[PDB]
Amino acid sequence: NTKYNKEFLLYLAGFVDGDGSIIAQIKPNQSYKFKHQLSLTFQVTQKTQRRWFLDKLVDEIGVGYVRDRGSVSNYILSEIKPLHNFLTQLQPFLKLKQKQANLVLKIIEQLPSAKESPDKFLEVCTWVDQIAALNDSKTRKTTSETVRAVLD
Amino acid sequence: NTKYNKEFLLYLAGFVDGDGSIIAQIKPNQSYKFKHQLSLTFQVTQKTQRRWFLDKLVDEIGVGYVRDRGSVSNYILSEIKPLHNFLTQLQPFLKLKQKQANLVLKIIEQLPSAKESPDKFLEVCTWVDQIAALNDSKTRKTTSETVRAVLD
DNA sequence: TCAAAACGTCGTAC
DNA sequence: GACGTTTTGA
DNA sequence: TCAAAACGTCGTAC
DNA sequence: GACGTTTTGA
Ligand SMILES: [Mn+2]
Ligand SMILES: [Mn+2]
Ligand SMILES: [Mn+2]
């Protein structure tokens, strides 16, 4: 687990509160025991003409990748272990998205428990709802209620 | 002059690179000698439900103000002297808007001597052209070229 | 005549 | 910015 | 059955 | 985000 520079984490936290995103999703998927995937994503979005900035995130964080689609690019970090290491060191300096980062950390630690029992899986989905409530959520479709209707 | 904490500047520089703006305008106004106002503005925009974040900025920067218009709020720093002091300390930590920051610092330093000759005024106006170029400019009307047309 | 505020608009880059 | 659906590669 | 990637959509908050 | 137009008041 790499330890990040403090001056870098301070800058990055500011940028993240601005144009970053801490996302938790419940993704419908038949090939899972509970018919859903718990997905977490750290994301920093930026215009493609400035993807050089996002490339430097890949170099400094040491993990993750950049995806271009249209006129816009995104730094993506999804791997649960590095994501937990990174958000642990970024969380103290976040102001607008601190709670989300903490809920994500909380979710990742309780991930193996989430597969064991349907009750635990539902409660973790409840935390995903809390992250969604704190973000500027507009197009959310799958909630813990959706999961509760499936776990029967 | 007010000295700013380094860690405060590092975070803020990040958030500025994300949701902030360094704006330089040539405002057409007949009351001025050269029929144009040189206007500099440091801006930080945010959804009005997160207004407190910007209200916090005023207390920390110690100058400037917050204005609401609908679902969007802005922190504005227009006062030339506190702006120069602020930007001087913030500039080292900027990555996306560092060039435009430093250009603003040069305009401010040349403002008084730019009121003396119409040629130096035009030279300064070109510095604001460089700023609008570095920005994601989409609705710009008054450039140095239009200033040149009026000075004849 | 000027610094600064006030008020307003629009198209993406989030 | 913050989601959505679908596929890959174990 | 999973983690992760790939691919795709949409409404503002910049 | 990044501009625009108009007004205030020494
Ligand atoms: Mn933002
Ligand atoms: Mn931005
Ligand atoms: Mn933004």
mmCIF file of all heavy atoms in Angstrom, chain E residues 1-13:
data_model
loop_
_atom_site.group_PDB
_atom_site.id
_atom_site.type_symbol
_atom_site.label_atom_id
_atom_site.label_comp_id
_atom_site.label_asym_id
_atom_site.label_seq_id
_atom_site.Cartn_x
_atom_site.Cartn_y
_atom_site.Cartn_z
ATOM 1 O "O5'" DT E 1 -23.798 -18.895 -7.111
ATOM 2 C "C5'" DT E 1 -22.927 -18.508 -8.172
ATOM 3 C "C4'" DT E 1 -21.772 -17.686 -7.630
ATOM 4 O "O4'" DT E 1 -20.656 -17.700 -8.551
ATOM 5 C "C3'" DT E 1 -22.080 -16.219 -7.370
ATOM 6 O "O3'" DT E 1 -21.456 -15.868 -6.134
ATOM 7 C "C2'" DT E 1 -21.511 -15.495 -8.596
ATOM 8 C "C1'" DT E 1 -20.346 -16.393 -9.001
ATOM 9 N N1 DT E 1 -20.070 -16.515 -10.471
ATOM 10 C C2 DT E 1 -18.831 -16.156 -10.961
ATOM 11 O O2 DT E 1 -17.938 -15.714 -10.259
ATOM 12 N N3 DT E 1 -18.669 -16.324 -12.312
ATOM 13 C C4 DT E 1 -19.602 -16.812 -13.205
ATOM 14 O O4 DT E 1 -19.371 -16.930 -14.404
ATOM 15 C C5 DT E 1 -20.871 -17.178 -12.631
ATOM 16 C C7 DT E 1 -21.946 -17.720 -13.521
ATOM 17 C C6 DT E 1 -21.044 -17.020 -11.309
ATOM 18 P P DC E 2 -21.709 -14.424 -5.477
ATOM 19 O OP1 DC E 2 -21.370 -14.507 -4.042
ATOM 20 O OP2 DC E 2 -23.069 -13.991 -5.874
ATOM 21 O "O5'" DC E 2 -20.685 -13.486 -6.270
ATOM 22 C "C5'" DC E 2 -19.799 -12.594 -5.647
ATOM 23 C "C4'" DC E 2 -18.519 -12.549 -6.465
ATOM 24 O "O4'" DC E 2 -18.641 -13.279 -7.708
ATOM 25 C "C3'" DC E 2 -18.086 -11.166 -6.906
ATOM 26 O "O3'" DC E 2 -17.426 -10.583 -5.816
ATOM 27 C "C2'" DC E 2 -17.139 -11.463 -8.068
ATOM 28 C "C1'" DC E 2 -17.644 -12.807 -8.600
ATOM 29 N N1 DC E 2 -18.195 -12.811 -10.008
ATOM 30 C C2 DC E 2 -17.323 -12.762 -11.107
ATOM 31 O O2 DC E 2 -16.102 -12.692 -10.916
ATOM 32 N N3 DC E 2 -17.839 -12.783 -12.361
ATOM 33 C C4 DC E 2 -19.158 -12.854 -12.551
ATOM 34 N N4 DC E 2 -19.611 -12.878 -13.812
ATOM 35 C C5 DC E 2 -20.060 -12.910 -11.446
ATOM 36 C C6 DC E 2 -19.541 -12.891 -10.211
ATOM 37 P P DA E 3 -17.221 -8.997 -5.754
ATOM 38 O OP1 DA E 3 -16.761 -8.677 -4.379
ATOM 39 O OP2 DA E 3 -18.422 -8.337 -6.318
ATOM 40 O "O5'" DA E 3 -16.004 -8.742 -6.752
ATOM 41 C "C5'" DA E 3 -14.740 -9.312 -6.440
ATOM 42 C "C4'" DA E 3 -13.683 -8.770 -7.381
ATOM 43 O "O4'" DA E 3 -14.014 -9.129 -8.744
ATOM 44 C "C3'" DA E 3 -13.498 -7.261 -7.392
ATOM 45 O "O3'" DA E 3 -12.133 -7.030 -7.656
ATOM 46 C "C2'" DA E 3 -14.389 -6.805 -8.542
ATOM 47 C "C1'" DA E 3 -14.335 -7.980 -9.509
ATOM 48 N N9 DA E 3 -15.580 -8.306 -10.200
ATOM 49 C C8 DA E 3 -16.850 -8.314 -9.687
ATOM 50 N N7 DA E 3 -17.771 -8.684 -10.551
ATOM 51 C C5 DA E 3 -17.060 -8.943 -11.710
ATOM 52 C C6 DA E 3 -17.460 -9.376 -12.993
ATOM 53 N N6 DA E 3 -18.734 -9.631 -13.322
ATOM 54 N N1 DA E 3 -16.495 -9.541 -13.927
ATOM 55 C C2 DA E 3 -15.223 -9.284 -13.587
ATOM 56 N N3 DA E 3 -14.724 -8.873 -12.413
ATOM 57 C C4 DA E 3 -15.706 -8.720 -11.509
ATOM 58 P P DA E 4 -11.547 -5.535 -7.698
ATOM 59 O OP1 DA E 4 -10.094 -5.632 -7.412
ATOM 60 O OP2 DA E 4 -12.416 -4.675 -6.863
ATOM 61 O "O5'" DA E 4 -11.731 -5.095 -9.226
ATOM 62 C "C5'" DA E 4 -10.992 -5.773 -10.228
ATOM 63 C "C4'" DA E 4 -11.543 -5.465 -11.604
ATOM 64 O "O4'" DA E 4 -12.929 -5.846 -11.676
ATOM 65 C "C3'" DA E 4 -11.542 -4.002 -12.026
ATOM 66 O "O3'" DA E 4 -10.432 -3.821 -12.892
ATOM 67 C "C2'" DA E 4 -12.881 -3.812 -12.748
ATOM 68 C "C1'" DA E 4 -13.432 -5.226 -12.832
ATOM 69 N N9 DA E 4 -14.887 -5.345 -12.808
ATOM 70 C C8 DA E 4 -15.738 -4.991 -11.797
ATOM 71 N N7 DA E 4 -17.002 -5.231 -12.062
ATOM 72 C C5 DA E 4 -16.979 -5.786 -13.332
ATOM 73 C C6 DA E 4 -18.000 -6.258 -14.182
ATOM 74 N N6 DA E 4 -19.299 -6.247 -13.856
ATOM 75 N N1 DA E 4 -17.627 -6.746 -15.384
ATOM 76 C C2 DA E 4 -16.328 -6.761 -15.710
ATOM 77 N N3 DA E 4 -15.281 -6.350 -14.995
ATOM 78 C C4 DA E 4 -15.681 -5.867 -13.806
ATOM 79 P P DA E 5 -10.188 -2.415 -13.626
ATOM 80 O OP1 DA E 5 -8.727 -2.282 -13.839
ATOM 81 O OP2 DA E 5 -10.941 -1.361 -12.901
ATOM 82 O "O5'" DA E 5 -10.908 -2.592 -15.041
ATOM 83 C "C5'" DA E 5 -10.608 -3.688 -15.884
ATOM 84 C "C4'" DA E 5 -11.592 -3.733 -17.041
ATOM 85 O "O4'" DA E 5 -12.924 -3.993 -16.539
ATOM 86 C "C3'" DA E 5 -11.698 -2.454 -17.864
ATOM 87 O "O3'" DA E 5 -11.292 -2.767 -19.185
ATOM 88 C "C2'" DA E 5 -13.173 -2.048 -17.785
ATOM 89 C "C1'" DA E 5 -13.870 -3.332 -17.349
ATOM 90 N N9 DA E 5 -15.091 -3.134 -16.562
ATOM 91 C C8 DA E 5 -15.195 -2.542 -15.333
ATOM 92 N N7 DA E 5 -16.421 -2.502 -14.861
ATOM 93 C C5 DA E 5 -17.179 -3.114 -15.837
ATOM 94 C C6 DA E 5 -18.558 -3.383 -15.929
ATOM 95 N N6 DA E 5 -19.436 -3.055 -14.975
ATOM 96 N N1 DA E 5 -18.999 -4.004 -17.045
ATOM 97 C C2 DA E 5 -18.109 -4.333 -17.991
ATOM 98 N N3 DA E 5 -16.789 -4.130 -18.013
ATOM 99 C C4 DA E 5 -16.379 -3.510 -16.895
ATOM 100 P P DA E 6 -11.298 -1.643 -20.332
ATOM 101 O OP1 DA E 6 -10.263 -2.055 -21.307
ATOM 102 O OP2 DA E 6 -11.266 -0.283 -19.736
ATOM 103 O "O5'" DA E 6 -12.738 -1.801 -20.997
ATOM 104 C "C5'" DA E 6 -13.215 -3.074 -21.381
ATOM 105 C "C4'" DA E 6 -14.616 -2.922 -21.935
ATOM 106 O "O4'" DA E 6 -15.584 -2.826 -20.859
ATOM 107 C "C3'" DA E 6 -14.800 -1.681 -22.796
ATOM 108 O "O3'" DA E 6 -15.374 -2.099 -24.014
ATOM 109 C "C2'" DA E 6 -15.755 -0.802 -21.994
ATOM 110 C "C1'" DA E 6 -16.525 -1.818 -21.157
ATOM 111 N N9 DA E 6 -17.036 -1.253 -19.910
ATOM 112 C C8 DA E 6 -16.324 -0.541 -18.989
ATOM 113 N N7 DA E 6 -17.037 -0.139 -17.962
ATOM 114 C C5 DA E 6 -18.303 -0.619 -18.217
ATOM 115 C C6 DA E 6 -19.515 -0.531 -17.504
ATOM 116 N N6 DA E 6 -19.641 0.101 -16.335
ATOM 117 N N1 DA E 6 -20.603 -1.124 -18.049
ATOM 118 C C2 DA E 6 -20.474 -1.753 -19.223
ATOM 119 N N3 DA E 6 -19.386 -1.897 -19.981
ATOM 120 C C4 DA E 6 -18.322 -1.306 -19.419
ATOM 121 P P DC E 7 -15.393 -1.117 -25.282
ATOM 122 O OP1 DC E 7 -15.217 -1.984 -26.473
ATOM 123 O OP2 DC E 7 -14.457 0.006 -25.022
ATOM 124 O "O5'" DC E 7 -16.875 -0.499 -25.258
ATOM 125 C "C5'" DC E 7 -18.020 -1.360 -25.256
ATOM 126 C "C4'" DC E 7 -19.228 -0.672 -24.636
ATOM 127 O "O4'" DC E 7 -18.998 -0.406 -23.228
ATOM 128 C "C3'" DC E 7 -19.615 0.682 -25.226
ATOM 129 O "O3'" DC E 7 -20.770 0.541 -26.032
ATOM 130 C "C2'" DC E 7 -19.921 1.564 -24.015
ATOM 131 C "C1'" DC E 7 -19.959 0.558 -22.873
ATOM 132 N N1 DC E 7 -19.646 1.195 -21.578
ATOM 133 C C2 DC E 7 -20.652 1.262 -20.609
ATOM 134 O O2 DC E 7 -21.754 0.758 -20.868
ATOM 135 N N3 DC E 7 -20.384 1.865 -19.422
ATOM 136 C C4 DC E 7 -19.166 2.382 -19.205
ATOM 137 N N4 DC E 7 -18.931 2.964 -18.021
ATOM 138 C C5 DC E 7 -18.133 2.327 -20.194
ATOM 139 C C6 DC E 7 -18.411 1.735 -21.359
ATOM 140 P P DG E 8 -21.352 1.802 -26.844
ATOM 141 O OP1 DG E 8 -22.064 1.251 -28.022
ATOM 142 O OP2 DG E 8 -20.261 2.795 -27.013
ATOM 143 O "O5'" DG E 8 -22.420 2.457 -25.843
ATOM 144 C "C5'" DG E 8 -23.412 1.628 -25.250
ATOM 145 C "C4'" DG E 8 -24.230 2.407 -24.240
ATOM 146 O "O4'" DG E 8 -23.435 2.667 -23.058
ATOM 147 C "C3'" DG E 8 -24.730 3.763 -24.731
ATOM 148 O "O3'" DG E 8 -26.156 3.746 -24.731
ATOM 149 C "C2'" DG E 8 -24.161 4.776 -23.737
ATOM 150 C "C1'" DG E 8 -23.833 3.914 -22.523
ATOM 151 N N9 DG E 8 -22.770 4.416 -21.644
ATOM 152 C C8 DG E 8 -21.414 4.455 -21.879
ATOM 153 N N7 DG E 8 -20.719 4.951 -20.887
ATOM 154 C C5 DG E 8 -21.671 5.259 -19.926
ATOM 155 C C6 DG E 8 -21.522 5.824 -18.637
ATOM 156 O O6 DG E 8 -20.484 6.182 -18.057
ATOM 157 N N1 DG E 8 -22.751 5.963 -18.000
ATOM 158 C C2 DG E 8 -23.967 5.606 -18.534
ATOM 159 N N2 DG E 8 -25.052 5.822 -17.772
ATOM 160 N N3 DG E 8 -24.116 5.075 -19.737
ATOM 161 C C4 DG E 8 -22.932 4.931 -20.375
ATOM 162 P P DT E 9 -26.987 4.940 -25.417
ATOM 163 O OP1 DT E 9 -28.209 4.367 -26.031
ATOM 164 O OP2 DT E 9 -26.043 5.724 -26.243
ATOM 165 O "O5'" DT E 9 -27.426 5.857 -24.185
ATOM 166 C "C5'" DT E 9 -28.218 5.292 -23.146
ATOM 167 C "C4'" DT E 9 -28.506 6.325 -22.072
ATOM 168 O "O4'" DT E 9 -27.308 6.581 -21.302
ATOM 169 C "C3'" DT E 9 -28.972 7.685 -22.581
ATOM 170 O "O3'" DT E 9 -30.339 7.863 -22.195
ATOM 171 C "C2'" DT E 9 -28.010 8.712 -21.960
ATOM 172 C "C1'" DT E 9 -27.318 7.923 -20.857
ATOM 173 N N1 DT E 9 -25.892 8.256 -20.526
ATOM 174 C C2 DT E 9 -25.594 8.746 -19.271
ATOM 175 O O2 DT E 9 -26.445 8.953 -18.421
ATOM 176 N N3 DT E 9 -24.259 8.993 -19.049
ATOM 177 C C4 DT E 9 -23.212 8.798 -19.934
ATOM 178 O O4 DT E 9 -22.042 9.052 -19.638
ATOM 179 C C5 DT E 9 -23.590 8.279 -21.226
ATOM 180 C C7 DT E 9 -22.538 8.031 -22.263
ATOM 181 C C6 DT E 9 -24.891 8.028 -21.455
ATOM 182 P P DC E 10 -31.140 9.190 -22.625
ATOM 183 O OP1 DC E 10 -32.582 8.853 -22.665
ATOM 184 O OP2 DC E 10 -30.465 9.793 -23.794
ATOM 185 O "O5'" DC E 10 -30.877 10.202 -21.425
ATOM 186 C "C5'" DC E 10 -31.115 9.808 -20.090
ATOM 187 C "C4'" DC E 10 -30.793 10.982 -19.190
ATOM 188 O "O4'" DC E 10 -29.373 11.037 -18.901
ATOM 189 C "C3'" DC E 10 -31.135 12.346 -19.776
ATOM 190 O "O3'" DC E 10 -31.623 13.125 -18.714
ATOM 191 C "C2'" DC E 10 -29.783 12.878 -20.242
ATOM 192 C "C1'" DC E 10 -28.916 12.359 -19.106
ATOM 193 N N1 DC E 10 -27.450 12.337 -19.384
ATOM 194 C C2 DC E 10 -26.555 12.526 -18.320
ATOM 195 O O2 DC E 10 -27.006 12.708 -17.179
ATOM 196 N N3 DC E 10 -25.221 12.501 -18.573
ATOM 197 C C4 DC E 10 -24.778 12.301 -19.817
ATOM 198 N N4 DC E 10 -23.451 12.285 -20.010
ATOM 199 C C5 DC E 10 -25.678 12.110 -20.913
ATOM 200 C C6 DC E 10 -26.993 12.136 -20.655
ATOM 201 P P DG E 11 -32.845 14.140 -18.934
ATOM 202 O OP1 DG E 11 -34.090 13.359 -18.751
ATOM 203 O OP2 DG E 11 -32.596 14.904 -20.181
ATOM 204 O "O5'" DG E 11 -32.682 15.165 -17.715
ATOM 205 C "C5'" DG E 11 -32.379 14.651 -16.421
ATOM 206 C "C4'" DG E 11 -31.622 15.669 -15.588
ATOM 207 O "O4'" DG E 11 -30.201 15.613 -15.858
ATOM 208 C "C3'" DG E 11 -32.023 17.118 -15.811
ATOM 209 O "O3'" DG E 11 -31.955 17.774 -14.553
ATOM 210 C "C2'" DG E 11 -30.972 17.621 -16.803
ATOM 211 C "C1'" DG E 11 -29.736 16.864 -16.340
ATOM 212 N N9 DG E 11 -28.778 16.560 -17.398
ATOM 213 C C8 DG E 11 -29.067 16.198 -18.692
ATOM 214 N N7 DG E 11 -28.006 15.961 -19.410
ATOM 215 C C5 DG E 11 -26.940 16.175 -18.540
ATOM 216 C C6 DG E 11 -25.546 16.067 -18.767
ATOM 217 O O6 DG E 11 -24.955 15.751 -19.812
ATOM 218 N N1 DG E 11 -24.819 16.369 -17.621
ATOM 219 C C2 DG E 11 -25.370 16.735 -16.418
ATOM 220 N N2 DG E 11 -24.503 16.981 -15.431
ATOM 221 N N3 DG E 11 -26.673 16.839 -16.189
ATOM 222 C C4 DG E 11 -27.400 16.544 -17.295
ATOM 223 P P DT E 12 -32.776 19.128 -14.305
ATOM 224 O OP1 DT E 12 -32.789 19.354 -12.839
ATOM 225 O OP2 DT E 12 -34.059 19.033 -15.028
ATOM 226 O "O5'" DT E 12 -31.909 20.238 -15.064
ATOM 227 C "C5'" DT E 12 -31.028 21.117 -14.371
ATOM 228 C "C4'" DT E 12 -29.966 20.423 -13.535
ATOM 229 O "O4'" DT E 12 -29.087 19.619 -14.364
ATOM 230 C "C3'" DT E 12 -29.035 21.411 -12.858
ATOM 231 O "O3'" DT E 12 -28.336 20.765 -11.820
ATOM 232 C "C2'" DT E 12 -28.105 21.714 -14.021
ATOM 233 C "C1'" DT E 12 -27.852 20.299 -14.507
ATOM 234 N N1 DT E 12 -27.382 20.216 -15.921
ATOM 235 C C2 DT E 12 -26.029 20.171 -16.159
ATOM 236 O O2 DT E 12 -25.203 20.206 -15.268
ATOM 237 N N3 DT E 12 -25.677 20.081 -17.481
ATOM 238 C C4 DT E 12 -26.525 20.029 -18.569
ATOM 239 O O4 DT E 12 -26.109 19.948 -19.718
ATOM 240 C C5 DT E 12 -27.930 20.082 -18.252
ATOM 241 C C7 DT E 12 -28.939 20.034 -19.360
ATOM 242 C C6 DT E 12 -28.287 20.169 -16.962
ATOM 243 P P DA E 13 -28.309 21.400 -10.344
ATOM 244 O OP1 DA E 13 -28.750 20.320 -9.425
ATOM 245 O OP2 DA E 13 -29.009 22.701 -10.359
ATOM 246 O "O5'" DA E 13 -26.754 21.717 -10.097
ATOM 247 C "C5'" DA E 13 -25.796 20.657 -10.087
ATOM 248 C "C4'" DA E 13 -24.423 21.136 -10.533
ATOM 249 O "O4'" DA E 13 -24.460 21.545 -11.926
ATOM 250 C "C3'" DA E 13 -23.845 22.332 -9.782
ATOM 251 O "O3'" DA E 13 -22.436 22.165 -9.695
ATOM 252 C "C2'" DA E 13 -24.231 23.518 -10.665
ATOM 253 C "C1'" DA E 13 -24.075 22.905 -12.051
ATOM 254 N N9 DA E 13 -24.907 23.464 -13.111
ATOM 255 C C8 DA E 13 -26.103 24.126 -12.999
ATOM 256 N N7 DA E 13 -26.618 24.486 -14.158
ATOM 257 C C5 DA E 13 -25.704 24.022 -15.093
ATOM 258 C C6 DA E 13 -25.659 24.076 -16.501
ATOM 259 N N6 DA E 13 -26.606 24.649 -17.254
ATOM 260 N N1 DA E 13 -24.595 23.515 -17.113
ATOM 261 C C2 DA E 13 -23.643 22.941 -16.373
ATOM 262 N N3 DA E 13 -23.573 22.832 -15.046
ATOM 263 C C4 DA E 13 -24.643 23.392 -14.463
#
